[PDB]
Coordinates of C-alpha atoms and ligand atoms in Angstrom, one line a residue:
Chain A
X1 CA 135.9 -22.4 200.4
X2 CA 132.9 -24.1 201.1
X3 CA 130.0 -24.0 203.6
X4 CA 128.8 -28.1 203.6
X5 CA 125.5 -29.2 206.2
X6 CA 124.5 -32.7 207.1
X7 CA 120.8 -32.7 208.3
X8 CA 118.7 -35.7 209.3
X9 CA 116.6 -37.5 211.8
X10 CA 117.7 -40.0 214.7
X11 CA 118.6 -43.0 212.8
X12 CA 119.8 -41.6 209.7
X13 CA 123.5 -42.3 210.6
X14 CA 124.2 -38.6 210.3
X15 CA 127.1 -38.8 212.8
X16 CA 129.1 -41.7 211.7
X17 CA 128.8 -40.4 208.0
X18 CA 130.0 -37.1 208.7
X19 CA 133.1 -38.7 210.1
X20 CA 133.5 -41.2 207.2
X21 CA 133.6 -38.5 204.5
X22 CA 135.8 -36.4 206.3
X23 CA 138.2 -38.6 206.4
X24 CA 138.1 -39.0 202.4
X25 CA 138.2 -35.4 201.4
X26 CA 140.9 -34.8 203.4
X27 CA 143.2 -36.1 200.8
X28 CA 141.9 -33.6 198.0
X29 CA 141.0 -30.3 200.5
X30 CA 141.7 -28.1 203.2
X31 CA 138.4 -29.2 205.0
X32 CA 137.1 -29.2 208.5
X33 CA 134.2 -30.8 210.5
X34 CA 132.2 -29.1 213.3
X35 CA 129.3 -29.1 215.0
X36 CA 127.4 -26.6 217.2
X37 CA 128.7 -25.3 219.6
X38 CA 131.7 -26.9 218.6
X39 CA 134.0 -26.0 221.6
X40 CA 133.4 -22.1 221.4
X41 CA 133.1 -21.1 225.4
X42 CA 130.4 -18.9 225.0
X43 CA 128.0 -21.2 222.4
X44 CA 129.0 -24.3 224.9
X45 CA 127.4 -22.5 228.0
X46 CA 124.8 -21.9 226.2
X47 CA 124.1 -25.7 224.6
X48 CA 124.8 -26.5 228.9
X49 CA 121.4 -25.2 229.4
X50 CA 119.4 -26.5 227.0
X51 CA 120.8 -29.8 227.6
X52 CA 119.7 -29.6 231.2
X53 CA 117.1 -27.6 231.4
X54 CA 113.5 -30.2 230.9
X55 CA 110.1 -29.2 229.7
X56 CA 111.4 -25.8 228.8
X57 CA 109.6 -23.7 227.3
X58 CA 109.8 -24.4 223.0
X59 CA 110.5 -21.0 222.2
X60 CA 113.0 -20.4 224.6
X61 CA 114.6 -23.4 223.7
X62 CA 114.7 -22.5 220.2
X63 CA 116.4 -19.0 221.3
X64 CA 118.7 -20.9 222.7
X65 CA 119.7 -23.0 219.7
X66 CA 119.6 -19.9 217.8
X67 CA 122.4 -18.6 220.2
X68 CA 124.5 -21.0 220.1
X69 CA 124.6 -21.6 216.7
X70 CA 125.4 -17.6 216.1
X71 CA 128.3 -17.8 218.3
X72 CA 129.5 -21.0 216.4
X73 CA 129.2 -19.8 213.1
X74 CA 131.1 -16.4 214.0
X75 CA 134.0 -17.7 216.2
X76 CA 134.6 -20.6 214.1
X77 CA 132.8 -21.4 210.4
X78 CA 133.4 -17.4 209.4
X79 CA 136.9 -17.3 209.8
X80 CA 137.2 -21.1 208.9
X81 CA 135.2 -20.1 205.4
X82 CA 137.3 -16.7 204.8
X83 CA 140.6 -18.8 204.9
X84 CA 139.4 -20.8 201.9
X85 CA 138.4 -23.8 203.8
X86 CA 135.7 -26.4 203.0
X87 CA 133.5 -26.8 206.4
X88 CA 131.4 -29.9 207.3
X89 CA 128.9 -28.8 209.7
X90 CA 126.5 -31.3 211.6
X91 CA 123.6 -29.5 212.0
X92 CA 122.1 -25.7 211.3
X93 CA 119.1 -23.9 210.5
X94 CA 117.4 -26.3 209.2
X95 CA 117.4 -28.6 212.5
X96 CA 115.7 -26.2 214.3
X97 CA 113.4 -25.6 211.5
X98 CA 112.3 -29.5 211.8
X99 CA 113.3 -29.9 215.7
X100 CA 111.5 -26.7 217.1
X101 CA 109.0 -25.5 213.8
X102 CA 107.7 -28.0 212.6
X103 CA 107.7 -31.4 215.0
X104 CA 107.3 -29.1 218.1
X105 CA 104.6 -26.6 216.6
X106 CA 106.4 -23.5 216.9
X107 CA 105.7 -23.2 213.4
X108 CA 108.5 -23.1 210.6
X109 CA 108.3 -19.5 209.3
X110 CA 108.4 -18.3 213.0
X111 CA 111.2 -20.1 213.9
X112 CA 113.0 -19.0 210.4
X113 CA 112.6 -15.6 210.8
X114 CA 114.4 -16.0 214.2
X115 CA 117.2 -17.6 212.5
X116 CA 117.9 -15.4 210.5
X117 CA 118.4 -12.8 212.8
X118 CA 120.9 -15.1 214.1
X119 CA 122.4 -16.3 210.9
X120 CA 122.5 -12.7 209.1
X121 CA 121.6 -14.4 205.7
X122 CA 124.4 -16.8 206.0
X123 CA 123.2 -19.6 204.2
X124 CA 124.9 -23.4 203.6
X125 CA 126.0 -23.7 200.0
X126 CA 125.3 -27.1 200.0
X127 CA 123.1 -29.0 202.7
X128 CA 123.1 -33.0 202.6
X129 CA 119.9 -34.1 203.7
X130 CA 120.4 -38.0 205.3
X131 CA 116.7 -39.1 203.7
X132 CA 116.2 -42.2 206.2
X133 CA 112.6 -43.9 207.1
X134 CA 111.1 -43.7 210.1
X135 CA 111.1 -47.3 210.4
X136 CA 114.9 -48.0 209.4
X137 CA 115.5 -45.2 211.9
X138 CA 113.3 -46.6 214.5
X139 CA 115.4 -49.5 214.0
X140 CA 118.8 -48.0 214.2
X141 CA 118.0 -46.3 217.2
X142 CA 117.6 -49.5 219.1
X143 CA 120.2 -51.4 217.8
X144 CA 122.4 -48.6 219.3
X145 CA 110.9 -47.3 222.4
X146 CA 108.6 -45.6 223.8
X147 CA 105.3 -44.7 221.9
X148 CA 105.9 -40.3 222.5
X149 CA 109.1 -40.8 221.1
X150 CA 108.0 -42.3 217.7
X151 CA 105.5 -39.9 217.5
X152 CA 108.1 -37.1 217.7
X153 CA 110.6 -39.1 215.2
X154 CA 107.2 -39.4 212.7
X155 CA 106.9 -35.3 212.7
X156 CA 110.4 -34.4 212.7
X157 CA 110.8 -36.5 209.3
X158 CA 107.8 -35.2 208.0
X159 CA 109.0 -31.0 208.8
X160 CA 112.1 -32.3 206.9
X161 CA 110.4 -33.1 203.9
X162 CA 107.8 -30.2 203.9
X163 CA 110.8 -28.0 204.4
X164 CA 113.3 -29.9 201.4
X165 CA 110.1 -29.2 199.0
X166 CA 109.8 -25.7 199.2
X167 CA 113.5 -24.9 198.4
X168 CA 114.9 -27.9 196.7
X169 CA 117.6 -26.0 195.0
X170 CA 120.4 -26.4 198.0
X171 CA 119.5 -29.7 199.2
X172 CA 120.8 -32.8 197.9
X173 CA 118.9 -35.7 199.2
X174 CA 120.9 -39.0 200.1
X175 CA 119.3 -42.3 200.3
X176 CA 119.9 -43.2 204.3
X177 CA 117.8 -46.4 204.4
X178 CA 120.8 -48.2 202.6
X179 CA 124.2 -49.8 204.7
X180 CA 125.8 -46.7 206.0
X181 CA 129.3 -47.8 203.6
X182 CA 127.0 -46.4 200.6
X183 CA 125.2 -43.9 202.3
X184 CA 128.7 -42.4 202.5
X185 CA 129.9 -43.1 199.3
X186 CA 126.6 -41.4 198.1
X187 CA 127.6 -38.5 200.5
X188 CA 130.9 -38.3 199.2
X189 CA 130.1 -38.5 195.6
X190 CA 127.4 -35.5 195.9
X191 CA 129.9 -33.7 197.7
X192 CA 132.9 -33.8 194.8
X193 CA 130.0 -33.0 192.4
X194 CA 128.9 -30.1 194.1
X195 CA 132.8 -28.7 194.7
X196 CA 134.5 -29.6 191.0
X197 CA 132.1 -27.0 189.0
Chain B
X1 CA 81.8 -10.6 249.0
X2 CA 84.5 -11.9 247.0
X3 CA 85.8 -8.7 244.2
X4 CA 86.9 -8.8 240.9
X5 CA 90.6 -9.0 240.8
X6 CA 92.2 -6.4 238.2
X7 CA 95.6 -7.3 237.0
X8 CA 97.6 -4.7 235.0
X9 CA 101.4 -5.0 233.7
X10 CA 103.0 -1.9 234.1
X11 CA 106.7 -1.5 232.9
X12 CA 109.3 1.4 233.7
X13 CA 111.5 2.5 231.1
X14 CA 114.6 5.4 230.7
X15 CA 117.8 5.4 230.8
X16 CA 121.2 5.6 233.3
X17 CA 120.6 8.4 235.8
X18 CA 116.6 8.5 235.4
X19 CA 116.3 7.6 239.2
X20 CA 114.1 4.5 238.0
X21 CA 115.2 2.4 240.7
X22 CA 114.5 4.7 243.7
X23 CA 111.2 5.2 241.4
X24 CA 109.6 1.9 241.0
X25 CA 110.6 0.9 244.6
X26 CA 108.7 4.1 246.0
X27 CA 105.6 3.6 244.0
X28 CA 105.6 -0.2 244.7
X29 CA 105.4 0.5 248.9
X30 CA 102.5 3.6 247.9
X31 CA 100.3 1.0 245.7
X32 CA 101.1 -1.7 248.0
X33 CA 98.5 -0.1 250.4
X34 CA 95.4 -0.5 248.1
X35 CA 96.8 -2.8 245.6
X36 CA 98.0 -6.3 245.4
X37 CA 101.3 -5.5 243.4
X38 CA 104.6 -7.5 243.3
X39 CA 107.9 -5.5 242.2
X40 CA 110.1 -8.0 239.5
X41 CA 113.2 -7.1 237.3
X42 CA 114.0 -9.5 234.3
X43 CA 115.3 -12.3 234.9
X44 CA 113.5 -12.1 238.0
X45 CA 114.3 -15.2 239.8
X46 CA 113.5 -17.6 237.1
X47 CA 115.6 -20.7 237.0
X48 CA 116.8 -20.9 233.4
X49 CA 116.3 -17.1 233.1
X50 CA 119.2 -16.8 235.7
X51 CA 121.1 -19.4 234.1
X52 CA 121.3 -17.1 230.7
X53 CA 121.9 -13.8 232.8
X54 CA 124.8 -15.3 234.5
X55 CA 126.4 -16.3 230.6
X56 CA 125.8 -12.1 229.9
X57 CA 127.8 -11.7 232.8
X58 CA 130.7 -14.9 232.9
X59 CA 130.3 -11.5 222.7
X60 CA 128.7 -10.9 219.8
X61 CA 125.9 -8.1 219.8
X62 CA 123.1 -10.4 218.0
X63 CA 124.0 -13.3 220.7
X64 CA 123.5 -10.9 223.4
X65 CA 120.0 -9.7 222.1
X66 CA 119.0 -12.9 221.8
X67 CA 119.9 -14.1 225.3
X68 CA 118.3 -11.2 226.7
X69 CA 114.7 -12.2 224.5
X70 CA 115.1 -15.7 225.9
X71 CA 115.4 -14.5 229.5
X72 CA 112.3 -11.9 229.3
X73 CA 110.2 -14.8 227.6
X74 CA 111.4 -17.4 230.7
X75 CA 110.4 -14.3 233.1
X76 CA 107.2 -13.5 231.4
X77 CA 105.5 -17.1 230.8
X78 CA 107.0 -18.4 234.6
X79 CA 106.4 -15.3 236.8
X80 CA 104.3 -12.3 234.8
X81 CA 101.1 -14.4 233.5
X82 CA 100.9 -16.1 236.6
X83 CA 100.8 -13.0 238.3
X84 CA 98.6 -11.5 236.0
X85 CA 96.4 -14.6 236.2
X86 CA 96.2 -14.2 239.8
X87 CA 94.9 -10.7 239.7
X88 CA 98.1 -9.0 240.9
X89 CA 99.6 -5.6 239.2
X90 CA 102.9 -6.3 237.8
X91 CA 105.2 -3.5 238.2
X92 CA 108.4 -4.5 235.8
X93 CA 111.7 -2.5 235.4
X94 CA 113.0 -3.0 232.2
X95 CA 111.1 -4.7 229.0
X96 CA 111.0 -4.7 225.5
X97 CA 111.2 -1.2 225.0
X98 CA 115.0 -1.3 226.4
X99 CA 116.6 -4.1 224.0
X100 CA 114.6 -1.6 221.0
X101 CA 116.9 1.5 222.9
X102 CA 119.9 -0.7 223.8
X103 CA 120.6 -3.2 221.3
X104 CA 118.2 -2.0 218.8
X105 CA 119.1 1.5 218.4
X106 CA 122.0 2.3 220.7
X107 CA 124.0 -0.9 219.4
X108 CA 123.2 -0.1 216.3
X109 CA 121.4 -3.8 215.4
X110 CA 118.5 -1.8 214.1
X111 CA 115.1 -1.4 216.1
X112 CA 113.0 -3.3 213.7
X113 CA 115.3 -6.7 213.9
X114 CA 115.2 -6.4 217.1
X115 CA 111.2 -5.5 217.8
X116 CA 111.3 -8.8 215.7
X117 CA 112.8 -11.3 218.0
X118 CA 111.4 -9.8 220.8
X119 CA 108.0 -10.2 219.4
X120 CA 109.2 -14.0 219.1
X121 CA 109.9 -14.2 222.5
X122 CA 106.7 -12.0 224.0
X123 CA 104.1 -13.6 221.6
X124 CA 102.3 -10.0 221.3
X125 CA 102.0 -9.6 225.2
X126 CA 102.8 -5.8 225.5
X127 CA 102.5 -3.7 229.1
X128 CA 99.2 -2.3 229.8
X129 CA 101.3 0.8 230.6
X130 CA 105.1 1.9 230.0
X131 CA 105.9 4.7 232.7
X132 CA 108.8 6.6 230.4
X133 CA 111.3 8.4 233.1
X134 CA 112.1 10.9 230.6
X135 CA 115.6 12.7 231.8
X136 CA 118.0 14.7 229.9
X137 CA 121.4 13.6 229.0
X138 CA 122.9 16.3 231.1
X139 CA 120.5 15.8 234.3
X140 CA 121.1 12.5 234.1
X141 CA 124.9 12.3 233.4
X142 CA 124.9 15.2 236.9
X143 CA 123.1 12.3 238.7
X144 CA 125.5 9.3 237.6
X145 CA 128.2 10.9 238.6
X146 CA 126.4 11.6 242.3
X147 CA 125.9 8.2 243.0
X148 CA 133.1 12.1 235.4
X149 CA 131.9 9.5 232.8
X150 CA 134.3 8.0 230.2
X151 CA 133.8 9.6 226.8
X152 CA 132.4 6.2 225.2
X153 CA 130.2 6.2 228.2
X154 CA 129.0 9.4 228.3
X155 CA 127.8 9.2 224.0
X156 CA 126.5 5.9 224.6
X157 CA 124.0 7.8 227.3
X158 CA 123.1 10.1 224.4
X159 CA 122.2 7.3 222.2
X160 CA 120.1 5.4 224.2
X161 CA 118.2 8.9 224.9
X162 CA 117.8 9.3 221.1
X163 CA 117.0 5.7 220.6
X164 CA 114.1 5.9 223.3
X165 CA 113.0 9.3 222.3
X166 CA 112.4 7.5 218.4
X167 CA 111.1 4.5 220.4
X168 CA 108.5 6.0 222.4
X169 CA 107.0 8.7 220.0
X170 CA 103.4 8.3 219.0
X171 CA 103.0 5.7 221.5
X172 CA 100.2 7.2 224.2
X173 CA 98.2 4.1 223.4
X174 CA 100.8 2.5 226.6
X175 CA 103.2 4.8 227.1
X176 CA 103.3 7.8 229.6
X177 CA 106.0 10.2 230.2
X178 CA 106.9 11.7 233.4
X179 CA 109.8 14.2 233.9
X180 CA 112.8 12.9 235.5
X181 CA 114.6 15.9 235.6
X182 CA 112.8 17.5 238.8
X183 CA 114.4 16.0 241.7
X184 CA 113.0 12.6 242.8
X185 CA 110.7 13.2 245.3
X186 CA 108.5 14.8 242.2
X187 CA 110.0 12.1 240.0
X188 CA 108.1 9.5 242.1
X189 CA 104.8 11.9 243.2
X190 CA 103.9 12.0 239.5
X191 CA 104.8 8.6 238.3
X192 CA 102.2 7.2 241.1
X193 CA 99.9 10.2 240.5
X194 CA 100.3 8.2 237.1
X195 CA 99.8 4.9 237.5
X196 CA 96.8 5.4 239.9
X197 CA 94.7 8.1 237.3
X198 CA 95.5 4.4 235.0
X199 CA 94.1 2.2 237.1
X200 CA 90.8 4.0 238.5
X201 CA 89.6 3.3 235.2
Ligands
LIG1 C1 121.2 -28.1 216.1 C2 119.8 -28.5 216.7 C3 119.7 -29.7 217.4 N1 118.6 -30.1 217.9 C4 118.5 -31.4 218.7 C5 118.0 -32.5 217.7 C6 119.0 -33.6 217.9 N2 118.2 -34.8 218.1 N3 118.1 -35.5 217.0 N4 117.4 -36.6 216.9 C7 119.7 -33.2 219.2 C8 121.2 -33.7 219.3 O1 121.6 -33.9 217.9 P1 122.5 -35.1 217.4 O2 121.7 -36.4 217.6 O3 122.6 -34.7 215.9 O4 123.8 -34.9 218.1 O5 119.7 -31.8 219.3 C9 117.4 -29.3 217.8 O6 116.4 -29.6 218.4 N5 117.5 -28.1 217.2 C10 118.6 -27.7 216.6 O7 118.6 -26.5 216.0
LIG2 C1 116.3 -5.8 230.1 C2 117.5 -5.1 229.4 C3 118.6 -4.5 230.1 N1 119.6 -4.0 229.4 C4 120.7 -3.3 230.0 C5 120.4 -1.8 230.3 C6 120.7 -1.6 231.8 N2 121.6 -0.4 232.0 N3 122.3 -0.4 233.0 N4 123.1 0.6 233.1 C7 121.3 -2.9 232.3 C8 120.9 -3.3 233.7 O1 119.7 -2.7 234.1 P1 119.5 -1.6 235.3 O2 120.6 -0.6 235.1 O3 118.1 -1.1 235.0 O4 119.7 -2.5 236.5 O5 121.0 -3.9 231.3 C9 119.6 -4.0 228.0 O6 120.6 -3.6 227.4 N5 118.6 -4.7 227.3 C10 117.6 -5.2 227.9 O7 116.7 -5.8 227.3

């Protein structure tokens, strides 16, 4: 088995490259893709709120996330991972560590410790980190703004990389500024690295 | 002319059978007479804090803690502080000290993990006073049934007594115990006999 994230920005072509490499190691493994709450009832109702809910407050909001994402990762990637299953997740611990620690001001050791409650210790063992520019983002985003929302984008990519310094050892940075048919083939090749030793 | 306003958060704590309802209510209409007070229970009429009490309601132990913390923090930043702010006395049934008992303890998550979150979701903002109902299993189980318990039921009620008796020790610089096994009328006489020695100070 195998326990696979995809973090990134908006812009970094996070969804579509996800899909893309599923689609390729399905050949070779039993894999899956997901992403929070990824149809489980309870985590979905939850997700419902924060996607509705506006101007919320940041910490409950991150609760929230938290939540969700414990609900997710015991209904679905626990018994995915215990069947021997490689698992593509879009998203986890470390979006809320960028999204709500960092970019929003929470602060990131605050927000991790929260996690962790919700997580139990349960950490990716490999996490693909979608490394796009601001800029290339900014301009994927509109070929798919306002000047709060680049602001945001700015700090969100900058938690990322304050966060991928620290602990380098899990993360495997991909170089997202490039067409998205060799981000994923850079995807895809760090991937069958990572699972053949 | 125009007096100092003095706000206090006071929070009522103990378990099933404690008479804390018919407790807080009573003392709410007696302080309501020389006191601006409101009366609130979490979520407390808060939007989004009713929107995560009705998912506890329509799972996982940790989820559960973790949708209570979100719900007290919505209550407390939208409906506490303000009060507070406005120089009312916020009596509060239910608060921290019950997910440490209930999920903490009781549920077996462990009090410290859970004193953790809740910290998260509080930001430090404890009571000003924690009015502990303090009945015994038996009492309490005697008044239950009043208003037999199933054998999970009735050792759960032990364990949330244990957990609160751990909880609450070496706490006096909030807490305050009154007995809740003397029949209400007392049960209420000294909690207000309580709360007012608190706030002549
Ligand atoms: C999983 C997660 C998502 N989010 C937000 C970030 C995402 N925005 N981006 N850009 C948003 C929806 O994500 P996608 O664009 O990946 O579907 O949810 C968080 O703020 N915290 C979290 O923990
Ligand atoms: C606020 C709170 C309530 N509860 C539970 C205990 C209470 N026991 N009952 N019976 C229940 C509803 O509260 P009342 O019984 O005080 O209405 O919710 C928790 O378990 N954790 C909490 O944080």
């Amino acid at each position: 088995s195998a326990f696979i994230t995809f973090e990134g920005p908006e812009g970094s072509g996070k969804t579509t490259v996800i899909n893309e490499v599923y689609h390729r190691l399905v050949k070779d493994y039993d894999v899956i893709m997901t992403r929070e709450p990824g149809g489980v009832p309870t985590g979905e109702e939850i997700r419902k709120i924060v996607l509705e809910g506006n101007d919320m407050d940041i910490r409950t909001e991150a609760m929230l996330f938290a939540a969700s994402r414990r609900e997710h990762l015991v209904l679905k990637v626990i018994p995915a991972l215990k069947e021997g299953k490689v698992v593509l997740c879009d998203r986890y611990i470390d979006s809320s560590l960028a999204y709500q620690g960092y970019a929003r001001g929470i602060g990131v050791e605050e927000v991790r410790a929260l996690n962790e409650f919700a997580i139990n210790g349960l950490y990716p063992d490999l996490t693909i980190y979608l490394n796009v520019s601001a800029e290339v983002g900014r301009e994927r985003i509109i070929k798919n703004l306002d000047q709060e929302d680049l602001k945001f984008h700015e700090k969100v990519i900058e938690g990322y990389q304050e966060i991928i310094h620290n602990e380098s050892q899990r993360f495997k940075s991909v170089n997202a500024d490039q067409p998205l048919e060799n981000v994923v083939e850079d995807t895809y090749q760090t991937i069958i690295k990572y699972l053949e030793k």
